[PDB]
Design a protein around this ligand. Structure first.
Ligand code: CLA
Ligand code: CLA
Ligand code: CLA
Ligand code: CLA
Ligand code: CLA
Ligand code: CLA
Ligand code: CLA
Ligand code: CLA
Ligand SMILES: CCCCCCCCCCCCCCCCCC(=O)OC[C@H](CO[C@@H]1O[C@H](CO)[C@H](O)[C@H](O)[C@H]1O)OC(=O)CCCCCCCCCCCCCCCCC
Ligand SMILES: CC1=C(/C=C/C(C)=C/C=C/C(C)=C/C=C/C=C(C)/C=C/C=C(C)/C=C/C2=C(C)CCCC2(C)C)C(C)(C)CCC1
Ligand code: SF4
Ligand code: SF4
Lengths: 86, 79, 218, 119, 128, 663
């Protein structure tokens, strides 16, 4: 599994949530921006690592950062279809 | 031998071969004994490196360890 | 939210909920995989769509049900449906035993819509540059994972970086007296609270000795 | 004769370039299916857990992984920090040093080293 | 005073009283090497050059015994061969001990003994 | 859950990255593992030396080559391969006699110069080096046990005070100590090793090279010069005196740092703290980088001076030894040079602590403050050299293709000629003030022509670009404008996604990967320069200012004997050379697909193949793929495998050409 971290610079775009192809991200209420909402990654075990969330993030440097961990890959982080690891 | 390359043919460079044996079979066996010793010791070293240090030996292993008197001096001389 | 009773795909042959789909080799590989993902939705008209595994399909005017090997295919189909103004679609992960796990609209509200009761998971309270240096956390809990450090550890290592640049005012750690300390561990005086007082007095002696030695040629 | 060393070759060359390599490949593929396979680079192996716990049992390396290890008198450090924060506390602020540090140590990263659950 | 000093850190060390140091009985001006205490000869306490300050005494006593044992035999061998005691079998007429080594290695009996000493010493190496 | 097929590549990509080990928890374990690995590697080196000595002793003709070295050829080892013709006779054997290989290493001249005369001495030397390998392994075991015994002595260790935990940092003081290591290395390992080799020369090498002389008197220390006429090599007396001088100097230097006592010598930390350094000397990667950067000038000068001033008997008389040694050592030093930069980048990623933002105290800090200036000026000089070397070469090519050799731009290499003139005046003044003059220096100063100037500019271009790529990777390993968090990730990682413009080849490891191609190209240029000047100095001097000459009169022309090796007319003793030539071409081209074609295509291909396997009647009932799931190689693994193929092909394609052209 990868590591998807959300930083304080988030401005509640919701673009990262919409771009995620495996429903890793979600919007949670907060009080650090005018949108009163920040992103969260409660399900990074389903994060394939496509980094579309990083493409969609418009902050100066990404408020959402995906750290690839190749020696950590699970069946969900690899998108295995022909083969089951469970 | 069938030489190749221009220089070997145009200079007559030849490769002599000893008509004797070189080393007798006894000498080769003598070398192979020590090669086997190296081999056994290297397998043991590979095992030790693979398993690494065991810190929990002080709970089971006998003795009480030892720091050589120079190693203590090297410890307190600095770093 | 109430999880449905999504049966195992090998036991629900010929169900009325299955949309009319062409069927291709892209479907989940049986005989090798037992974990299947199922997505259900209720439509209004039999609008044609595209299966994530190749081939097109026609929904049913009532309930719909599809089985897929990967959650990604279910989410792709969910986005495709949501583009057609079809909400109320749920995505389930089926375990090998048949256990049904409710996954995509986890709390019943889509993740792009703020819902109360959620907490920022994997949140870091600083700019991305605020992460501690990897070199600082060597052989600690975060040996090669400086982005996983708790903010207190980041502040602590930042303060350490600030401190370990004023070299002249640092305190050199005294060299241990190996030869005359180091008795058997059973040979201890206990008195833990007194041991910190001994620390204080010994360090005071060390500092006084260092000051006296420095005030000879400086 | 210049030959007569080929008696050694006719055994050694087939041996070390066919029998030993084949045995090595078979032993390697067998080793690949051990629970200990590549325990130093592959996460979540049993031997890695045992080695980490063995290191933690050593009296020197008990509090070695703690990034904050080193404070000789942490009570003195905490008292000094609390005193320094009291003189700089903004107006009627209700945050203390103790709970501030407690909540700054507790982060929410469930998916960190979750591979410590199989072996 | 067996300890080299009495302190807590080696910057404020308090060296032991000069008349109170243990001191070696062999070399009276040197402190006693405490690493030798327990071993057989550790009453003359003789280790200048400090070769036991660096090397486990188990090694040195192993080397000391091997040297002494091998010399006790070699001294007897040289004395007997010099006084004239050549083994009963023929081919052992080396006339003189000084040329016995080169004579016998030519005959072929030294290569046998070197093998027999070699295997026992390899067994010794495993034991050590 | 379990792993996929990429586990093997992932594990083997960091199989020796002891810092990445999972059980390793402290610098004690890391340092002890590294020390034991050093012992094992020394054992491997000793076994390799004993191997060469054995094969020279047994399957070779040292006893006959020593008698008539100039026209004779040495034997590497016998050939025992059941694939050859069981009938007739191979081109590598004298009819019914066994099959042999000609040695191109140079060990024969080494042993002859060192004083070897008989096979028995070589056999005894082989035995002694095998003994030394045993000794090295036993030392590894000894040190593992001594450190484990210190660890166990921590079961009887307490300071009776909370400062007892300080002993954690001193457990590996045996390995991590620097002052003692520097003192004893520079003194013993350098100076006294040189002095012992001077003793070896005076006792054996000089006695076993001339008629019997006095009892190794001090007249054995001469100051002649170079190239003794008869053997076309340096005087052994000169070599002994050189080693004696170096030994004395390094022995004196070795008493610099505070090694064994606190009352003698200055500390390295205090030396650095009062200079333009004060780097983090506790980093193992930093030490490795700066000693690899030390073995690089040593190996490059070894390559240069084995050829320019041949030190071994009859080494210049071998047309293949001289080129093979130079090319080998040039490649070794290029690898070490790029290694130094790679480990500097790894040091910056892993083992460097930096101030907050502005404290310009560390040397790395000051370098990083203006890193953009460094990279911009390196790019400028690289662009200038490339433009003005390629353009002048193109001018010469075009004007010589147009039947106008006199229209070329030939800048006379005036600066190199001035340096050569000054050195030659110094050497001639040395020689003229001798009663035993008429000495020779072989190729210490060589004819320098406009072709030499252009090739030197090309070599400078290659070095500049290699340093540019490596230095940019090192300086931006901790963060660039494109990816301002690069020190949070590994030293090598795939990419940063297709967004933000696209981020392929963004890691510092990717900078190393790009720079290895330029290292190979620069080394190829250097080796081509040396080999072309070696084959025909006259033709190189005249026709080497236009690249078509390099293409035709060197590559196309000198490849004639190699391709003719095995054909439909018979075979030569170059058959292995031609076969390896083609095999290395295949290896070089095979790595193109690992570099050009990238992962996703192949991952889809592997999914299709896996579909087949899970669809085939018998396979599906034995193997569902859930155990060792076949997956396409990851991105970094793919780049590394393509780099390995490319490097192997480019490097190993050259020795067949060298052997075919020179022999
Ligand atoms: C010379 C270099 C080279 C070689 C050998 C290959 C080889 C291959 N490519 Mg490839 N490729 C290359 C360069 C090369 N490529 C380059 C530069 C590109 C540009 C991007 C591509 C792009 C590319 C694509 C896009 C595709 C291929 C495909 C293929 C495969 C189809 C051919 C096949 O199966 O034959 C078999 C392979 C051989 C090398 C033939 C020789 C086999 C040897 C001689 C016999 C066995 C040796 C013997 C067992 C020795 C044992 C080993 C020893 C250790 C004991 C094959 C593995 C296709 C594929 O995989 O589809 C099936 C495919 O889709 N390639
Ligand atoms: C190879 C021979 C050898 C070896 C390995 C030892 C080993 C040992 N002896 Mg021992 N001893 C020896 C010969 C040897 N002895 C002889 C011949 C005598 C008679 C004088 C003694 C008398 C003696 C006494 C009285 C005592 C010891 C003790 C010891 C122990 C501690 C001393 C130590 O660390 O030295 C070990 C290391 C070495 C001996 C290496 C020395 C090698 C040097 C470099 C050679 C220098 C001499 C050289 C040949 C002369 C130069 C010739 C010319 C220039 C003048 C140790 C087990 C002490 C003991 O019992 O402690 C438990 C003790 O009290 N020894
Ligand atoms: C340090 C010990 C030592 C050594 C190296 C020698 C060496 C030698 N002796 Mg000698 N000798 C010794 C002690 C020694 N001696 C003692 C103590 C005595 C008195 C009993 C003699 C009495 C003696 C006689 C009377 C003669 C020799 C002769 C010789 C020479 C030829 C021997 C031969 O061919 O092998 C014969 C032996 C073998 C082929 C193998 C014997 C088996 C070995 C020695 C025992 C096993 C090896 C190992 C040590 C295992 C024991 C372990 C133990 C520690 C528990 C040779 C130079 C001969 C000579 O010089 O004249 C021609 C001769 O005639 N020796
Ligand atoms: C089918 C192809 C084939 C195969 C399988 C072999 C197999 C072998 N050749 Mg060989 N050879 C071949 C074709 C082949 N040859 C051709 C076409 C030529 C050119 C005419 C040669 C020329 C040749 C020479 C000159 C030598 C060999 C040797 C060897 C042996 C070395 C094995 C070894 O040490 O592995 C080690 C493998 C590696 C280090 C590679 C690791 C990757 C081995 C039996 C050597 C020999 O006789 O050894 C005793 C040797 O000196 N071969
Ligand atoms: C060429 C550069 C150089 C410089 C600037 C110094 C400078 C210094 N050295 Mg030094 N040294 C050098 C080369 C150098 N050394 C070399 C090549 C050696 C090997 C012979 C030594 C061996 C050496 C020792 C053994 C000691 C010094 C010491 C000293 C310091 C006292 C100066 C003194 O009393 O000397 C007149 C001083 C900082 C002394 C010092 O202060 O150490 C704490 C000391 O003990 N040096
Ligand atoms: C106004 C035009 C202009 C100016 C003043 C400079 C000035 C500079 N460039 Mg540069 N550059 C330019 C355009 C320009 N560049 C363009 C268009 C490119 C894209 C190819 C580059 C690519 C480039 C690189 C890659 C590098 C520089 C570098 C440099 C610096 C060293 C000098 C050098 O290498 O020149 C050589 C310049 C080139 C090789 C680029 C080609 C020159 C172009 C074609 C000139 C275009 C001028 C323009 C058409 C004028 C139109 C006027 C009209 C509208 C009125 C210097 C500050 C180097 C540096 O940073 O070192 C300090 C360096 O490494 N430049
Ligand atoms: C024939 C092959 C070839 C050529 C001509 C070049 C040319 C160049 N490479 Mg390049 N490169 C190549 C293959 C080649 N590369 C390969 C195979 C790799 C492996 C991926 C690289 C990797 C690489 C890196 C990593 C770098 C370069 C750089 C450069 C530039 C060096 C500066 C220079 O000389 O500019 C002169 C320009 C020319 C000679 C081109 C001709 C211009 C007209 C025709 C005149 C130049 C544009 C460096 C760079 O950008 O320098 C600023 C750099 O950083 N290259
Ligand atoms: C980036 C620029 C650059 C670089 C890296 C090199 C590098 C090298 N040159 Mg070189 N050279 C250059 C530019 C450069 N040159 C120019 C512009 C000329 C004039 C045509 C020469 C003429 C030249 C000769 C004649 C010789 C070398 C040689 C060498 C080699 C030995 C080092 C040496 O003595 O150089 C000298 C150092 C320099 C030239 C540095 C100057 C850098 C400046 C900035 C370049 C621009 C200067 C400018 C055009 C002057 C204009 C004057 C005008 C106002 C009147 C080395 C590979 C020697 C060689 O390889 O012999 C085997 C040799 O004999 N060079
Ligand atoms: C003639 C021969 C000369 C040619 C050899 C030149 C090769 C250059 C040497 C560079 C090696 C160091 C780089 C390296 O190991 O890492 C190169 C990469 C490093 O591996 C990367 O490491 C990263 C962490 O730093 C991440 O974990 C990445 O996921 C992981 O891929 O290694 C691999 O990808 C190896 C894959 C192929 C393994 C083949 C096994 C070899 C078995 C035959 C022996
Ligand atoms: C009994 C006997 C015999 C037999 C013998 C034999 C059987 C032998 C064999 C031998 C052999 C068969 C040998 C082999 C060897 C090998 C080697 C010697 C190798 C080595 C290697 C090394 C040393 C390295 C290692 C390593 C690695 C690579 C991994 C990692 C780690 C290390 C580094 C360790 C006879 C009768 C004859 C005689 C008598 C006695
Ligand atoms: S795209 Fe970036 S800024 Fe926008 S909500 Fe997601 S994380 Fe926050
Ligand atoms: S990397 Fe892809 S799957 Fe992972 S959180 Fe970002 S968008 Fe979602």
């Amino acid at each position: 599994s990868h590591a998807v971290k959300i930083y304080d610079t988030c401005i509640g775009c919701t673009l990262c949530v919409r771009a995620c192809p495996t429903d890793v991200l979600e919007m949670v209420p907060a009080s650090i921006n005018a949108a009163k909402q920040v992103a969260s990654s409660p399900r990074v075990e389903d994060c394939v690592g496509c980094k579309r969330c990083e493409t969609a993030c418009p902050t100066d440097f990404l408020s959402i950062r995906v750290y690839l961990q190749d020696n950590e890959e699970t069946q969900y982080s690899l998108g295995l279809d022909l083969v089951d690891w469970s | 031998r069938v030489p190749g390359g221009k220089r070997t043919q145009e200079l007559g460079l030849v490769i002599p071969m000893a008509d004797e044996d070189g080393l007798t079979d006894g000498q080769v066996a003598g070398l192979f004994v020590i090669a086997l010793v190296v081999f056994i010791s290297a397998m043991d070293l590979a095992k030790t490196m693979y398993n690494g240090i065991n810190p929990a030996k002080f709970k089971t292993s006998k003795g009480k360890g030892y720091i050589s008197p120079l190693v203590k001096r090297y410890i307190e001389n600095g770093f | 939210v109430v999880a449905e009773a999504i049966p195992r795909p090998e036991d629900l042959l010929d169900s009325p909920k299955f949309p009319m789909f062409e069927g291709s080799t892209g479907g989940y590989m049986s005989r090798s995989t037992r974990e299947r993902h199922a997505i259900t939705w209720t439509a209004k008209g039999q609008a044609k769509f595209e299966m994530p595994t190749g081939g097109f399909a026609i929904m049913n005017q009532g309930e719909n049900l599809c089985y897929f090997r990967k959650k990604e295919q279910c989410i792709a189909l969910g986005k495709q449906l949501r583009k057609m103004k079809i909400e109320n679609y749920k995505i389930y992960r089926l375990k090998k035993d048949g256990t049904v796990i409710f996954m995509h609209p986890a709390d019943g509200v889509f993740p792009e819509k703020v819902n109360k009761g959620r907490v920022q998971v994997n949140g870091r309270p600083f700019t991305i540059r605020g992460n501690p240096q990897q070199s600082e956390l060597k052989f600690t809990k975060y040996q090669g994972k400086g982005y996983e450090a708790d903010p207190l550890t980041t502040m602590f290592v930042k303060a350490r970086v600030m401190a370990f640049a004023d070299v002249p005012n640092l305190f050199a750690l005294p060299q241990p007296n190996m030869d005359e300390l180091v008795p058997a561990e059973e040979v201890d005086k206990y008195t833990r609270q007194e041991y910190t007082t001994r620390m204080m007095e010994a360090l005071k002696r060390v500092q006084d000795d260092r000051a006296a030695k420095a005030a000879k040629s400086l | 004769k210049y030959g007569d060393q080929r008696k050694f070759a006719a055994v050694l060359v087939p041996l070390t370039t066919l029998v030993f390599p084949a045995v090595a490949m078979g032993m390697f593929v067998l080793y690949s299916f051990q629970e200990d396979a590549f325990w130093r680079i592959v996460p979540g192996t049993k031997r890695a857990r045992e080695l980490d716990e063995a290191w933690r049992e050593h009296p020197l390396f008990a509090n070695s992984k703690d990034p904050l290890d080193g404070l000789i008198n942490p009570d003195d450090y905490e008292k000094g920090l609390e005193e320094a924060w009291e003189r700089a506390k903004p107006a009627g602020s209700t945050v203390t040093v103790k709970d501030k540090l407690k909540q700054l140590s507790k982060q929410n990263n469930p998916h960190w080293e979750s591979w410590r659950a199989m072996s | 005073x067996x300890x080299x000093x009495x302190x807590x850190x080696x910057x404020x060390x308090x060296x032991x009283x000069x008349x109170x140091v243990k001191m070696s009985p062999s070399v009276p001006y040197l402190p006693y090497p405490e690493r030798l205490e327990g071993w057989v000869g550790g009453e003359k306490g003789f280790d200048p050059l400090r070769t036991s300050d660096i090397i486990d005494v188990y090694w040195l006593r192993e080397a000391e015994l091997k040297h002494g044992r091998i010399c006790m035999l070699a001294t007897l061998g040289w004395i007997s061969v010099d006084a004239g005691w050549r083994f009963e079998a023929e081919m052992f007429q080396g006339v003189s001990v000084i040329n016995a080594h080169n004579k016998m290695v030519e005959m072929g009996v030294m290569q046998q003994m070197l093998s027999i000493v070699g295997v026992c010493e390899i067994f010794s190496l495993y034991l050590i | 859950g379990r792993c996929a097929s990429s586990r093997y590549l992932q594990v083997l990509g960091s199989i020796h990255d002891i810092e990445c080990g999972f059980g390793i928890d402290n610098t004690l374990s890391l340092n002890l593992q590294i020390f034991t690995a050093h012992w094992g590697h020394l054992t491997i080196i000793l076994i390799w030396v004993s191997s060469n000595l054995y094969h020279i002793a047994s399957n070779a003709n040292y006893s006959l080559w020593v008698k008539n070295p100039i026209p004779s050829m040495p034997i590497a080892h016998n050939i025992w391969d059941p694939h050859f013709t069981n009938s007739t006779s191979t081109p590598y054997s004298h009819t019914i006699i066994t099959t042999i290989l000609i040695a191109y290493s140079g060990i024969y001249n080494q042993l002859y110069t060192s004083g070897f005369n008989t096979i028995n001495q070589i056999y005894k030397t082989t035995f002694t080096f095998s003994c030394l390998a045993v000794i090295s392994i036993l030392l590894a075991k000894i040190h593992i046990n001594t450190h484990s015994e210190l660890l166990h002595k921590l079961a009887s260790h307490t300071s009776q005070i909370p400062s007892f935990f300080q002993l954690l940092y001193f457990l590996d003081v045996a390995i991590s100590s620097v002052n003692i290591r520097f003192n004893f290395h520079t003194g013993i390992l350098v100076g006294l090793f040189s002095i012992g080799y001077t003793g070896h020369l005076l006792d054996i090498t000089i006695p076993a090279s001339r008629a019997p002389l006095i009892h190794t008197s001090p007249s054995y220390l001469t100051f002649f010069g170079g190239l003794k006429s008869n053997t076309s090599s340096l005087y052994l007396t000169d070599i002994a005196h050189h080693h004696l001088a170096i030994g004395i100097i390094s022995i004196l230097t070795g008493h610099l740092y505070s090694s064994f006592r606190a009352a003698l010598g200055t500390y390295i930390r205090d030396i650095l703290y009062t200079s333009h350094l004060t780097h983090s000397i506790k980093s193992l990667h930093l030490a490795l980088s700066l000693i690899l950067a030390s073995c690089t000038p040593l190996t490059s000068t070894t390559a240069q001076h084995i050829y320019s001033l041949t030190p071994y008997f009859y080494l210049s008389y071998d047309h293949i030894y001289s080129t093979a040694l130079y090319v080998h050592h040039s490649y070794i030093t290029s690898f070490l040079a790029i290694a130094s930069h790679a480990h500097t980048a790894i040091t910056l990623v892993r083992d460097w602590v930096a101030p907050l933002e502005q404290e310009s105290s560390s040397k790395q800090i000051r370098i990083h403050t203006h890193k953009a200036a460094i990279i911009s000026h390196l790019s400028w000089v690289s662009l200038w050299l490339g433009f003005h070397t390629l353009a002048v070469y193109s001018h010469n090519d075009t004007c010589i293709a147009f039947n106008s050799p006199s229209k070329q731009i030939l800048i006379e290499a005036s600066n190199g000629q001035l340096i050569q003139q000054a050195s030659g005046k110094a050497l001639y003044g040395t020689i003229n003030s001798i009663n035993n003059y008429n000495k020779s220096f072989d190729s210490f100063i060589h004819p320098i022509s406009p072709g030499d100037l252009y090739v030197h500019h090309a070599i400078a271009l290659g070095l500049h670009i290699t340093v540019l790529i490596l230095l940019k990777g090192g300086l931006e390993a901790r963060g660039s404008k494109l990816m301002p968090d690069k020190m949070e990730h590994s030293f090598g990682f795939s990419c940063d996604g297709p967004g933000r413009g696209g981020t392929c080849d963004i890691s510092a490891w990717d900078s190393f990967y790009l720079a290895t191609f330029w290292m190979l190209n620069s080394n190829a240029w250097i080796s081509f320069y040396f080999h072309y000047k070696h084959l025909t100095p006259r033709q190189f001097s005249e026709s080497s200012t236009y690249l078509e000459s390099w293409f035709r009169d060197y590559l196309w022309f000198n490849s004639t004997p190699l391709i003719h090796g095995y054909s439909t007319l018979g075979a030569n003793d170059l058959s292995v050379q031609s076969w390896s030539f083609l095999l290395t071409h295949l290896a070089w081209a095979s790595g193109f697909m690992f570099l050009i074609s990238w992962r996703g295509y192949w991952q889809e291909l592997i999914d299709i193949i896996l579909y087949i396997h899970l669809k085939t009647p018998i396979l599906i009932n034995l193997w569902n793929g859930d155990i060792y799931t076949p997956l396409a190689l990851s991105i970094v693994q793919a780049r590394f495998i393509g780099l390995v193929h490319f490097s192997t092909g480019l490097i190993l394609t050259y020795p067949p050409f060298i052997i075919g052209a020179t022999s």
